[PDB]
mmCIF file of C-alpha atoms and ligand atoms in Angstrom:
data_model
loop_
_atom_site.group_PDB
_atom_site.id
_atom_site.type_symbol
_atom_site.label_atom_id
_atom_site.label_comp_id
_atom_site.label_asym_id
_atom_site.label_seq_id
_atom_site.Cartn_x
_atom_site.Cartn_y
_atom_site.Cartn_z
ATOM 1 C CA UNK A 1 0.000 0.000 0.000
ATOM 2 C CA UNK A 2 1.138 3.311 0.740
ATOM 3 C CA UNK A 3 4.853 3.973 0.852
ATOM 4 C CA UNK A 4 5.331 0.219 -0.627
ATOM 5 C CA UNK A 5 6.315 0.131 -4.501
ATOM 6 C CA UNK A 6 5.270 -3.413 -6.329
ATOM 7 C CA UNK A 7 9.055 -5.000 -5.417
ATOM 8 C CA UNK A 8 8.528 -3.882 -1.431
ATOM 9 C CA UNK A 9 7.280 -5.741 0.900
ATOM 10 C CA UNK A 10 6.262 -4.282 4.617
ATOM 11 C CA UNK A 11 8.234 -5.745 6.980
ATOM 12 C CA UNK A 12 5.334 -5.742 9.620
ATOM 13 C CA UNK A 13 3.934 -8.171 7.711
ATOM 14 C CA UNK A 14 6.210 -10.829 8.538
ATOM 15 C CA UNK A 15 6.300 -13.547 11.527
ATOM 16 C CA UNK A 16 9.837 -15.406 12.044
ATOM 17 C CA UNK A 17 9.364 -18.887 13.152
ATOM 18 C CA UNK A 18 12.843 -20.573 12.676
ATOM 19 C CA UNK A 19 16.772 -19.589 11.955
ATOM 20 C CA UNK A 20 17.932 -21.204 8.969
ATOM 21 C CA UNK A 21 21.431 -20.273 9.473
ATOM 22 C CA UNK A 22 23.785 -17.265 8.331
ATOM 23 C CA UNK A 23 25.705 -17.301 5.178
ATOM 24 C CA UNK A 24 27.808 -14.471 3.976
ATOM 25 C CA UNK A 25 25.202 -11.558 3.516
ATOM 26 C CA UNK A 26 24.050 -13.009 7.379
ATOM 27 C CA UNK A 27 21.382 -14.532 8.749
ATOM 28 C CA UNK A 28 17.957 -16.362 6.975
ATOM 29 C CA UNK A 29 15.067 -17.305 8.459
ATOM 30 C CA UNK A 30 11.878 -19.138 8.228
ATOM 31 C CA UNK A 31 8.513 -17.322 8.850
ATOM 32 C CA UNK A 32 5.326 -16.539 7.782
ATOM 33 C CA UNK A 33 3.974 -13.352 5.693
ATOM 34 C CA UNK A 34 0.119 -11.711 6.232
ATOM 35 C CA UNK A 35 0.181 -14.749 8.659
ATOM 36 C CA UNK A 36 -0.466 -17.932 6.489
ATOM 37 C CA UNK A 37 2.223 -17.727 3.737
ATOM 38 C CA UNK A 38 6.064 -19.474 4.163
ATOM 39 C CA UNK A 39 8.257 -17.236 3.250
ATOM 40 C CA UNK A 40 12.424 -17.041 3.818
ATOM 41 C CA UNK A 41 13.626 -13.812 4.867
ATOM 42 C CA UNK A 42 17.565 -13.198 4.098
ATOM 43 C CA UNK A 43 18.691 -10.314 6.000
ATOM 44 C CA UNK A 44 21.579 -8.300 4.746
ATOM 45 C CA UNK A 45 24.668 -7.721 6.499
ATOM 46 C CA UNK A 46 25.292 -4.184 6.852
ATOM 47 C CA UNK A 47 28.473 -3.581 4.674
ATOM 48 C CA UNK A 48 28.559 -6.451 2.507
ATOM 49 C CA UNK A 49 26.090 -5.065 -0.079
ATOM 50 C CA UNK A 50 26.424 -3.111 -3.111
ATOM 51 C CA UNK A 51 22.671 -1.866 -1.624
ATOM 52 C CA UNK A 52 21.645 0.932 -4.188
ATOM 53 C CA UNK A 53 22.582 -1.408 -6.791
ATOM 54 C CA UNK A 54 21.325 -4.840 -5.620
ATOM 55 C CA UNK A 55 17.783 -2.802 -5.043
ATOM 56 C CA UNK A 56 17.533 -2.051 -8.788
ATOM 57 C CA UNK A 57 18.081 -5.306 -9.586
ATOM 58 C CA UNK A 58 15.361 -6.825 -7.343
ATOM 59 C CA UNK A 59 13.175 -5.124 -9.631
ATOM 60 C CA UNK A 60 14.364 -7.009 -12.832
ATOM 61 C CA UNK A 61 14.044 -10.466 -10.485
ATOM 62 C CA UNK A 62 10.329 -9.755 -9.874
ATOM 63 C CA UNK A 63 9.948 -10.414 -13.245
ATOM 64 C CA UNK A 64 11.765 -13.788 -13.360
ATOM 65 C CA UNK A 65 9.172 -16.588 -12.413
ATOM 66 C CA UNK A 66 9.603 -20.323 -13.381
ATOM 67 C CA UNK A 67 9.098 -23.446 -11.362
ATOM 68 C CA UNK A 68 12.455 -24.747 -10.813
ATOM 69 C CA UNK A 69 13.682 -20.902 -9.933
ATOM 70 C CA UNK A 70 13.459 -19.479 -6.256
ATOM 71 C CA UNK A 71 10.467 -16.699 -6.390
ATOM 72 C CA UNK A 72 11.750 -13.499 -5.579
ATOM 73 C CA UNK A 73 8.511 -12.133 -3.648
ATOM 74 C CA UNK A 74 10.223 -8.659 -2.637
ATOM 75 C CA UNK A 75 12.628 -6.643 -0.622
ATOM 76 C CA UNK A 76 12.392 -4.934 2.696
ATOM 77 C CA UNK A 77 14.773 -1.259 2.107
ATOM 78 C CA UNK A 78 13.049 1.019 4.507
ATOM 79 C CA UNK A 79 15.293 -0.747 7.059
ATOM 80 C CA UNK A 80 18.729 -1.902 8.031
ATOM 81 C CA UNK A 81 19.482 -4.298 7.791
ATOM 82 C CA UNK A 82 17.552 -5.024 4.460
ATOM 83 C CA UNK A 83 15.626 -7.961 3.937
ATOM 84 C CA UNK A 84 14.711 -10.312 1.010
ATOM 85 C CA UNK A 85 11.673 -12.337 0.971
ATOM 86 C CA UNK A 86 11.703 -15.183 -1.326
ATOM 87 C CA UNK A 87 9.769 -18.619 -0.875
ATOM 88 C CA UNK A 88 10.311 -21.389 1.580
ATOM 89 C CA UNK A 89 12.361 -24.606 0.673
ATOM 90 C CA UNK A 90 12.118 -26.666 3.337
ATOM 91 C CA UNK A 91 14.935 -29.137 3.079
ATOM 92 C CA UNK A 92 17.807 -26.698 2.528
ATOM 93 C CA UNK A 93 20.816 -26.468 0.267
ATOM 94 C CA UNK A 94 21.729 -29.121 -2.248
ATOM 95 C CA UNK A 95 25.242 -29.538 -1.045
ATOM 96 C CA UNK A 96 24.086 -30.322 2.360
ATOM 97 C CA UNK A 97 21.052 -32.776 0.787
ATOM 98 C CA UNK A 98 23.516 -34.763 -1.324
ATOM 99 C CA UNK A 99 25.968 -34.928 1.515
ATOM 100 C CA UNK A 100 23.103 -37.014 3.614
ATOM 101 C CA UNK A 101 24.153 -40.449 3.177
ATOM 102 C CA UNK A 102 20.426 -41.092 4.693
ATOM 103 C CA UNK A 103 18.448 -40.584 1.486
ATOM 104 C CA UNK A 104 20.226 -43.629 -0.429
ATOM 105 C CA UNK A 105 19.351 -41.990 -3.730
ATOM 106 C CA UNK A 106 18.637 -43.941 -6.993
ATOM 107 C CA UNK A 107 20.511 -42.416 -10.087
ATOM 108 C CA UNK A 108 17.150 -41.783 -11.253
ATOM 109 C CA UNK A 109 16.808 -38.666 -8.703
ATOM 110 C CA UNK A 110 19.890 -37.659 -9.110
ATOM 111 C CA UNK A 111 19.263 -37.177 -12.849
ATOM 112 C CA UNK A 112 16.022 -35.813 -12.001
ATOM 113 C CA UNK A 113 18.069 -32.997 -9.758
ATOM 114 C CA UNK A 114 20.068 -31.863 -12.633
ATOM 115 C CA UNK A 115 17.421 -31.320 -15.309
ATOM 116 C CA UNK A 116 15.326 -29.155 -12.388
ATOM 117 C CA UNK A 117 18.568 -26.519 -12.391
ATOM 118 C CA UNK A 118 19.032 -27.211 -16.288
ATOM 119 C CA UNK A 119 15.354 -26.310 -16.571
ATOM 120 C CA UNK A 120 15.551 -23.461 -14.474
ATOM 121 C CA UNK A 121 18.827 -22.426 -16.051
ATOM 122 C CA UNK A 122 17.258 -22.946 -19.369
ATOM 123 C CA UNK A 123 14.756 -20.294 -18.421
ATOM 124 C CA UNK A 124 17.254 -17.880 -17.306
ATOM 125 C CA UNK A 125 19.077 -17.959 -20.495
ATOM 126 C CA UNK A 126 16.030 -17.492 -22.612
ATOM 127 C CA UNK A 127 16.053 -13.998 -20.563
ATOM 128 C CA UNK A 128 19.845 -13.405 -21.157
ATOM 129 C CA UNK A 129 19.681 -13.742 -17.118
ATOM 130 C CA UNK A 130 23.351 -14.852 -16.054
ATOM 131 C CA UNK A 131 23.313 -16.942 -12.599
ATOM 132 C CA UNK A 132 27.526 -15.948 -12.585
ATOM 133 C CA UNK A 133 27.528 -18.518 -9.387
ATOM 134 C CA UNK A 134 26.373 -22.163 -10.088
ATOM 135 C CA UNK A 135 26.988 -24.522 -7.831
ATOM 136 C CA UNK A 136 25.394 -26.970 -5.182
ATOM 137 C CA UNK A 137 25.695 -24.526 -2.606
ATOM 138 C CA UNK A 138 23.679 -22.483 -4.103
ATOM 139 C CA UNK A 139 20.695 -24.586 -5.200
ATOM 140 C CA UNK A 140 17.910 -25.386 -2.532
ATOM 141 C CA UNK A 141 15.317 -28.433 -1.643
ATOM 142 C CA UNK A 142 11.864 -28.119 -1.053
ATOM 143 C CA UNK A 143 9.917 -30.314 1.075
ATOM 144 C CA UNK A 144 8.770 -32.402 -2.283
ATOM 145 C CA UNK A 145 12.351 -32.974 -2.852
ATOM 146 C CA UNK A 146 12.131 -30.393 -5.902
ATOM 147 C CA UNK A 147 15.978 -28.626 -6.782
ATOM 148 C CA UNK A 148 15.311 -24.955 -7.604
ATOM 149 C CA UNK A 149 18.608 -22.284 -8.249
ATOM 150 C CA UNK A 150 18.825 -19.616 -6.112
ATOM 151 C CA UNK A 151 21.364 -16.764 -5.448
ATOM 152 C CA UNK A 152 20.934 -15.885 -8.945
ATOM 153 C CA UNK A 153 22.885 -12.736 -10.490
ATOM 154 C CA UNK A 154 23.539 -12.392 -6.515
ATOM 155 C CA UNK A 155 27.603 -12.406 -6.613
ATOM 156 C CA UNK A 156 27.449 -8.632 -8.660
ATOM 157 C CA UNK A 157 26.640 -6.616 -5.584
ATOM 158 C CA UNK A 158 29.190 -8.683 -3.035
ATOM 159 C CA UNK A 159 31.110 -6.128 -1.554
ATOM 160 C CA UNK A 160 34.107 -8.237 0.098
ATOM 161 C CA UNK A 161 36.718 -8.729 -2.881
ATOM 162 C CA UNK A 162 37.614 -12.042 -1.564
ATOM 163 C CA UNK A 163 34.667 -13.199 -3.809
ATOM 164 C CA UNK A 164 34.713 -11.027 -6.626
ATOM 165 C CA UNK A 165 37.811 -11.886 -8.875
ATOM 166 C CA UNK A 166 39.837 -14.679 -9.153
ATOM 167 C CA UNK A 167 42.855 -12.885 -7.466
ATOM 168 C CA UNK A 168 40.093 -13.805 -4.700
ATOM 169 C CA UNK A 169 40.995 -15.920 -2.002
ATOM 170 C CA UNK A 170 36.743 -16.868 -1.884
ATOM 171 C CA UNK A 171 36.178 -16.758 -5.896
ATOM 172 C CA UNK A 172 34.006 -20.376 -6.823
ATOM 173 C CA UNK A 173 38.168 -21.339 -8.573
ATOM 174 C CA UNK A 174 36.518 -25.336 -8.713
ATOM 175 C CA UNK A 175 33.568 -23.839 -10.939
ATOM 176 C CA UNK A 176 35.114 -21.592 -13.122
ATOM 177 C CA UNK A 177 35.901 -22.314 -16.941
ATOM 178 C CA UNK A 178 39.143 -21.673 -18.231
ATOM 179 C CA UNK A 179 38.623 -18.282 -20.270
ATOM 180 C CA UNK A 180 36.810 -16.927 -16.981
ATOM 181 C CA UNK A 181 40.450 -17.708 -14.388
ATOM 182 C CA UNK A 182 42.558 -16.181 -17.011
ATOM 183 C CA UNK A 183 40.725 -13.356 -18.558
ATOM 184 C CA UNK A 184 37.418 -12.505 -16.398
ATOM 185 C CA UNK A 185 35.541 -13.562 -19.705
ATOM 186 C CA UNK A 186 31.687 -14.591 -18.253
ATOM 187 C CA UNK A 187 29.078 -15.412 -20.456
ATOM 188 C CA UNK A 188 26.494 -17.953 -21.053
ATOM 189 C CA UNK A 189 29.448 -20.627 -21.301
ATOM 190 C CA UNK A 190 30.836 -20.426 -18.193
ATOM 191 C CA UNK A 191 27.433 -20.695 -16.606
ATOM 192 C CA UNK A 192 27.361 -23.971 -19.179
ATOM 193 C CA UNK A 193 31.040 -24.911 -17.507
ATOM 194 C CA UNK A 194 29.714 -24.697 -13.654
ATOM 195 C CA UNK A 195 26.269 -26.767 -14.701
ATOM 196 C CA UNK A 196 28.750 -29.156 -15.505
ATOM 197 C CA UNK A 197 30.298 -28.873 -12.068
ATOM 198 C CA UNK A 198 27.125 -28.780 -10.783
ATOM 199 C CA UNK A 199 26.027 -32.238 -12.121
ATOM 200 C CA UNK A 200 29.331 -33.689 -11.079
ATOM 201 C CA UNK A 201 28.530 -32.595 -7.366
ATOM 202 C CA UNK A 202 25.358 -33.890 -7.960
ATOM 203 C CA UNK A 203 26.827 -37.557 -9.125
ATOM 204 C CA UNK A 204 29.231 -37.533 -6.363
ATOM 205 C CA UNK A 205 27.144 -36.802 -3.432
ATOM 206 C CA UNK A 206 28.530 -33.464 -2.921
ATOM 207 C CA UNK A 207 32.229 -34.182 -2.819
ATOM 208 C CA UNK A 208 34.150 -30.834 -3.287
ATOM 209 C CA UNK A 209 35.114 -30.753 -6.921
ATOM 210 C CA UNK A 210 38.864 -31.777 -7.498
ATOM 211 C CA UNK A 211 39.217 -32.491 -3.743
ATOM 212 C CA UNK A 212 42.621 -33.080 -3.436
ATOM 213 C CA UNK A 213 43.975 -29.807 -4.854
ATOM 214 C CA UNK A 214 43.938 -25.742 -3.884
ATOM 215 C CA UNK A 215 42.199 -23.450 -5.800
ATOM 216 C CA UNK A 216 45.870 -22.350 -7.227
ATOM 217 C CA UNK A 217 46.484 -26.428 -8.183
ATOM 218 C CA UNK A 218 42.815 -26.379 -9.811
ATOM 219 C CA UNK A 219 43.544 -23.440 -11.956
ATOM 220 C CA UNK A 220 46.335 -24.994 -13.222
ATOM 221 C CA UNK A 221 45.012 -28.507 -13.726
ATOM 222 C CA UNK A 222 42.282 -27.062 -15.811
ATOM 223 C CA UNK A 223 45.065 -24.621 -17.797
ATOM 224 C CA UNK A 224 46.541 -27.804 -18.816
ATOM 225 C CA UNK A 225 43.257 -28.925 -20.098
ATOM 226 C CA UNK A 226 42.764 -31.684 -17.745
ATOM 227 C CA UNK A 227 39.153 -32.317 -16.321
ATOM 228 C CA UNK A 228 37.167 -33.956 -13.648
ATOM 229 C CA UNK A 229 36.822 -37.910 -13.957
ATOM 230 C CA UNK A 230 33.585 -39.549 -14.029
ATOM 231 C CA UNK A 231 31.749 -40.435 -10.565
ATOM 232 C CA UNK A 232 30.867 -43.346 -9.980
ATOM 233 C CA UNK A 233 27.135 -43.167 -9.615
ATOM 234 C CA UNK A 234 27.416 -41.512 -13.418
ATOM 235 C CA UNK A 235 26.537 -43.611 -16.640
ATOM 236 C CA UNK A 236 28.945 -42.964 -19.249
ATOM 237 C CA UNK A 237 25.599 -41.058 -21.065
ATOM 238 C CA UNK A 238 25.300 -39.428 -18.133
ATOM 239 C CA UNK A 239 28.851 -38.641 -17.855
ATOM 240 C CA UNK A 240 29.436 -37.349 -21.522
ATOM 241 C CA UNK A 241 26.827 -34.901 -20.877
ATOM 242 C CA UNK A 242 28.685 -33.080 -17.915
ATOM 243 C CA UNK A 243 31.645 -33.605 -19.762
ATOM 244 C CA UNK A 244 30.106 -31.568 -22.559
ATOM 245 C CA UNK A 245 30.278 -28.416 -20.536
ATOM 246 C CA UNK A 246 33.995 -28.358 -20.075
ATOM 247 C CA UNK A 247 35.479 -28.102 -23.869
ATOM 248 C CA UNK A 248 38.258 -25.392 -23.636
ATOM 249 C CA UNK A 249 36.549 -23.514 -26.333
ATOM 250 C CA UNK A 250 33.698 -21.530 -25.087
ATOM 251 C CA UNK A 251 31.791 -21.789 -28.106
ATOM 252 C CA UNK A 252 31.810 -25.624 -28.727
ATOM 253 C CA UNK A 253 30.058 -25.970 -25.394
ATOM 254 C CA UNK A 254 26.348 -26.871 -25.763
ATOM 255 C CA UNK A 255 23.599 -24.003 -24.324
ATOM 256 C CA UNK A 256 20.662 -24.991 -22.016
ATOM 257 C CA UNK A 257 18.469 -26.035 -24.160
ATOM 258 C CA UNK A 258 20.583 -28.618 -25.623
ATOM 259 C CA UNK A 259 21.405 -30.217 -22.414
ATOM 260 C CA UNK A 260 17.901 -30.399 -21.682
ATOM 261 C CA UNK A 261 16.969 -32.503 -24.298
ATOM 262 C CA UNK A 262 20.220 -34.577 -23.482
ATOM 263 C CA UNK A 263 19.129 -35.133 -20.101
ATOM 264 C CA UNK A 264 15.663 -36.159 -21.352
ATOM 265 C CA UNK A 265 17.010 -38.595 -23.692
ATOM 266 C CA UNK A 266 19.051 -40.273 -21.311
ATOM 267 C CA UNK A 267 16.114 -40.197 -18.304
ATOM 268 C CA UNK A 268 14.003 -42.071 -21.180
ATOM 269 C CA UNK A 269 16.793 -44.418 -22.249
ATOM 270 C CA UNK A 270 17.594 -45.194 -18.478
ATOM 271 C CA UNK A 271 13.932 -45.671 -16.995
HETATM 272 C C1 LIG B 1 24.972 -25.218 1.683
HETATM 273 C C2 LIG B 1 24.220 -23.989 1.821
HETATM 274 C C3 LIG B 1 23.637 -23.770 3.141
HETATM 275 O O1 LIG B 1 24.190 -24.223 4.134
HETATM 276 N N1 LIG B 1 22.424 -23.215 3.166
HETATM 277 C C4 LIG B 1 21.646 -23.085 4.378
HETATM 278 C C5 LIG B 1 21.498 -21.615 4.696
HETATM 279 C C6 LIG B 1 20.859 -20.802 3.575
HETATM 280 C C7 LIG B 1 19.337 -20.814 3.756
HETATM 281 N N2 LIG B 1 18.645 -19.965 2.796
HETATM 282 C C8 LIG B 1 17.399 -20.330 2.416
HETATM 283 N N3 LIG B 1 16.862 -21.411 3.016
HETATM 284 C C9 LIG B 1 15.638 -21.829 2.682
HETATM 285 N N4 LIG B 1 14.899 -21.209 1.758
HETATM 286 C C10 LIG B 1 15.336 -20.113 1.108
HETATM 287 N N5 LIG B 1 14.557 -19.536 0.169
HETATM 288 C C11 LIG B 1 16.600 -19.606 1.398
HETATM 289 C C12 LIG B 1 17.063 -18.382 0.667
HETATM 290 C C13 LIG B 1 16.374 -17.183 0.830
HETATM 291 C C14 LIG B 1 16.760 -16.040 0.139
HETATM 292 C C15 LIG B 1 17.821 -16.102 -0.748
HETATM 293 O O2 LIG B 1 18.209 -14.976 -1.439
HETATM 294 C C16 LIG B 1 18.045 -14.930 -2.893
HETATM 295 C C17 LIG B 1 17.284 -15.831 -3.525
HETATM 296 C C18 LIG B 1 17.201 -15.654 -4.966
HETATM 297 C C19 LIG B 1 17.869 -14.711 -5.464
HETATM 298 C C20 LIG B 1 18.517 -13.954 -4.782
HETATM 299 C C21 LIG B 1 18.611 -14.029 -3.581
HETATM 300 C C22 LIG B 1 18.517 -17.290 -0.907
HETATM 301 C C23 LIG B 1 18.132 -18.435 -0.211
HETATM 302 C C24 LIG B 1 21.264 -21.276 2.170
HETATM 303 C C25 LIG B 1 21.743 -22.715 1.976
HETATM 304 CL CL1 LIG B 2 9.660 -26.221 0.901
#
């Protein structure tokens, strides 16, 4: 209503129920909205925000709605620290799902996981909508077991340089294709590159990606044009797809859409 554009939401509105933990912008939390709707609530850090910016932005988000894609429902700015509402997923981050030995997943789910962020990240690139962060960390569970991508776009108003170049000692190195360690170069591909990542943390249930190395050792590995190996859980069809996403040359890599219909073939040929 008054003093409220269509991207803010009143924070009066809100009940918090439960702390879901802090990450780098802070704390999250469950609660409800208007009193009957889930809703997370990130709060923002004060410092760590390119605010002004990140505010803009939200506006643009609004706008992005698919099923497999965290809903932006608004921001709280009248306030510090500032708050973004988004919906609920109840079991968490991917990395932390995968890492659950508990679950005992058939490869069938974990396929299933990678074409809901391929789907999602098939959307996004049909709006020219770069994640620039991909990875299991960043992905969420809700309570159906559904993947959705999150923290989209997210990393361009991070205000602690330790995340924001390479020559960062908190840059996603493991993730990271090799045109975007040596030269900054982002673009569709390197979101391809980290999908790729992305299902390989998926096949391994959520190893770190080349484990045994730095960040400094991974860069180099990957200068060399060496790659991951294939997990164990992965099908050689499943495992030429990730592969896909990793040829040195940007252009040769395949885009969204493409790896949607791989994954689909393969689900069919594997049921
Ligand atoms: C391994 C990771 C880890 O330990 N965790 C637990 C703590 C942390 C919980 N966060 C959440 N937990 C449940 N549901 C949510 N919706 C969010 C959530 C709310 C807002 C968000 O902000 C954005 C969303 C989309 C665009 C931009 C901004 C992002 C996420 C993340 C994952
Ligand atoms: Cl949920």
């Amino acid at each position: 209503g008054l003093g409220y554009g269509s991207w803010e939401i009143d924070p009066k509105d809100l009940t918090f129920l439960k702390e879901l933990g802090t990450g780098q912008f802070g704390v999250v939390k469950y609660g409800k909205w208007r009193g009957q709707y889930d809703v997370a609530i990130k709060m923002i850090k004060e410092g760590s925000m390119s605010e002004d910016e990140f505010i803009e932005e939200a506006k643009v988000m609004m706008n992005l709605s698919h099923e497999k894609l965290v809903q932006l429902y608004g921001v709280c700015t009248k306030q510090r620290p500032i708050f973004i509402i988004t919906e609920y997923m109840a079991n968490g981050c991917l990395l932390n799902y995968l890492r659950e030995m508990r679950h005992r997943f058939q490869t069938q789910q974990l396929l299933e996981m990678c074409k809901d962020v391929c789907e999602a990240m098939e959307y996004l690139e049909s709006k020219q909508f770069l994640h620039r962060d991909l990875a299991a960390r960043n992905c969420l569970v809700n309570d159906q077991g559904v993947v959705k991508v999150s923290d989209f776009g997210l990393s361009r108003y991070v205000l602690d340089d330790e995340y924001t170049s390479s020559v960062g000692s908190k840059f996603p190195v493991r993730w990271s294709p090799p045109e975007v360690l040596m030269y900054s170069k982002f673009s569709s591909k390197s979101d391809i590159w980290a999908f790729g990542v992305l299902m390989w943390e998926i096949y391994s249930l959520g190893k770190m990606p080349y484990e045994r190395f730095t960040n400094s050792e991974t860069a180099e590995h990957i200068a060399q044009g060496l790659r991951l190996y294939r997990p164990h859980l992965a099908s050689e069809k499943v495992y030429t797809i990730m592969y896909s996403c990793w040829h040195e040359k940007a252009d040769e890599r395949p885009t969204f859409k493409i790896l949607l219909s791989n994954i689909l073939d393969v689900m069919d040929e594997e049921s």
